[PDB]
Amino acid sequence: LGINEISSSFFSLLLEILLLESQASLPMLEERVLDWQSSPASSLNSWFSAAPNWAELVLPALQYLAGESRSFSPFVEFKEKTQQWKLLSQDNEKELAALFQLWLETKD
Amino acid sequence: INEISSSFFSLLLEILLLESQASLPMLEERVLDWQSSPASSLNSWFSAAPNWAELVLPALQYLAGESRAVPSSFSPFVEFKEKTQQWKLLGDNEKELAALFQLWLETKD
Ligand code: NA
């Protein structure tokens, strides 16, 4: 997320961090999101107001993106042996945006 | 990493930050290639105009202070040097730029 802090959805934001890291732990993704949400410009994201604390939603977003919610195709996987999240965003943003809204409607 | 920016104004200033200096046709070619990317239409403000590259000059002239629809405490974000024909930034303004962008949208026509 170099240019700026603006992404099409929370889901695309996560997958954009993962494309750059290639692999990443949960604690690292959490810290990246926390730093990201503290930046004044991030509230310019149209979906930023959909939750009060985005860092805390990193795990449940990843699990949904992994297909652990309940034919969807997984965007990420977690490997227990390495404790790393991996990609399995570009051109999928429209789908991710739709899936994000669905998750927001269905999660709580 | 994606073609998403908070406003057309922030998109223009981000292209200037990298580049550091740029000509009008350079900026116009960059915006043309941007708007032709699929990802670009994801910008919430993309549809506020049908052709963004054709608005690069008036946008820059707005951000340069060459337009009267600006607040009293308006400090210009860019300048154009005629001797060089290059646009440059003037040395965390995104929220202000978003608001200024809407001001421009509302007042330009
Ligand atoms: Na962006």
Side-chain angles (χ1 to χ4, degrees), chain A residues 1-2 4-69 71-80 82-89 91-107, chain B residues 1-67 69-82 84-109:
Chain A
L1 76 198
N4 61 48
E5 317 319 315
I6 317 309
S7 193
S8 54
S9 66
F10 189 56
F11 287 174
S12 65
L13 174 80
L14 291 175
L15 299 184
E16 281 155 19
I17 290 165
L18 272 178
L19 189 66
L20 289 176
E21 297 300 313
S22 97
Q23 308 185 133
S25 73
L26 176 65
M28 183 262 259
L29 290 169
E30 286 179 340
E31 187 165 32
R32 287 290 234 100
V33 173
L34 181 59
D35 278 280
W36 163 88
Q37 69 197 42
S38 315
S39 300
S42 302
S43 59
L44 288 171
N45 280 286
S46 50
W47 47 268
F48 181 90
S49 59
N53 185 330
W54 286 110
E56 280 184 315
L57 293 184
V58 163
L59 178 51
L62 285 169
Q63 291 173 323
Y64 187 86
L65 287 171
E68 297 177 58
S69 169
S71 197
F72 178 65
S73 190
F75 291 91
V76 295
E77 63 170 357
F78 181 75
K79 229 73 158 312
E80 204 72 51
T82 76
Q83 294 297 300
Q84 302 293 324
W85 288 93
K86 273 170 73 194
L87 284 180
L88 280 167
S89 192
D91 308 307
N92 295 333
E93 287 154 68
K94 297 187 109 181
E95 180 197 345
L96 288 163
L99 284 175
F100 175 64
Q101 288 290 344
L102 176 60
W103 175 64
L104 285 180
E105 293 276 329
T106 292
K107 72 176 185 56
Chain B
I1 189 154
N2 70 33
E3 310 289 355
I4 316 303
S5 175
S6 47
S7 65
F8 186 58
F9 289 180
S10 64
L11 184 85
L12 291 183
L13 304 182
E14 288 150 8
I15 293 163
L16 282 174
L17 190 61
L18 317 169
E19 309 299 338
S20 83
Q21 322 188 54
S23 78
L24 181 63
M26 182 285 168
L27 293 165
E28 290 170 339
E29 189 179 21
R30 293 296 316 272
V31 172
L32 179 58
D33 290 333
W34 166 82
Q35 68 201 42
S36 314
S37 298
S40 293
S41 69
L42 298 174
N43 286 281
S44 54
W45 53 268
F46 183 75
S47 67
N51 188 343
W52 286 113
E54 279 199 304
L55 294 181
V56 164
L57 183 53
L60 291 168
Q61 290 171 330
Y62 185 80
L63 290 155
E66 288 171 31
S67 165
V70 301
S72 154
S73 56
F74 178 74
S75 201
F77 294 80
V78 303
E79 52 157 33
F80 181 76
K81 278 294 177 71
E82 234 98 46
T84 66
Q85 296 286 306
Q86 304 288 320
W87 286 94
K88 265 179 66 245
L89 297 172
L90 286 164
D92 313 338
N93 283 318
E94 278 181 73
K95 291 174 95 190
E96 177 197 358
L97 288 159
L100 288 177
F101 168 65
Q102 301 287 357
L103 181 55
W104 181 61
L105 287 189
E106 292 280 351
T107 54
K108 80 186 168 57
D109 42 49

